[PDB]
């Protein structure tokens, strides 16, 4: 290309003009990778005034990302100060969000972290809810100290329902449970638990309810799992035939320490009517199949108990349908 046999020094005073091109950018990124200090200085001096515009640029963003790694702490702090008032603009941009995630990954000082929290805090929900913005917010949780990412938990505490039930907010909620302090995660789960009814039936909320259990199961320490089960068990059948509620029922059926109480509810307060409802539902069928699969593995008394209610129902029509044939497969094992 144009820059194969070119040299940083010939571009001094014209570096910004290269930051348009994909090839100019890659040239510069090369120079940053190999010089590098002198490259970082030259490039920092000629692009600092335009960081926002290079951050939200399709090729320029990758340059700033590279620049951020290679630049000194003094320089990095300047790039942060210049861009910080425009974090919303940058976070909404498909590229801006990638450049700004790198910035966060790169910060070493606590002054740098205070500038970032100060700059993001006012906009936490908006960004949590944004297709590009939510990632900047998650990076904060992945990278900062809990004391610095508190603001995210605080903002969520106040818009919990809409953030939990949001396509992207739900991913940010899950990042909170990944990195949150026990105290943080507890205060958050308390709020979520007050909303477990709504969340369970929700397209996106049901995943948050599952994730709590996922996380607790990871640690082998159970708290909110038990509190959730306690609230939803009384509706085991009702939720088993729900597009989204059934995701949670299955999640519980697949969590060894709570499997059997749930299977029991299905057996007792469901009976042949409830079970026939499952066998015959677009959703509860799979839940029914989960029930048989788990019970066969964990508890012969429950499996045989389920089997003897199910098998009388598997006759005629159902037997030849795909869903009928599915349960038939779970029957004698």
UniProtKB/Swiss-Prot annotation:
The Pumilio repeat ranges on this chain: 10-45, 46-81, 82-118, 119-154, 155-190, 191-230, 231-268, 270-308
Superkingdom classification of source: Eukaryota
Annotated PUM-HD domain residues: 1-333
Primary role: Is not essential for haploid growth, but may affect diploid formation.
Additional detail: Present with 721 molecules/cell in log phase SD medium.
Official protein name in the record: Pumilio homology domain family member 4
Provenance organism: Saccharomyces cerevisiae (strain ATCC 204508 / S288c) (Baker's yeast)
Gene that encodes the chain: PUF4
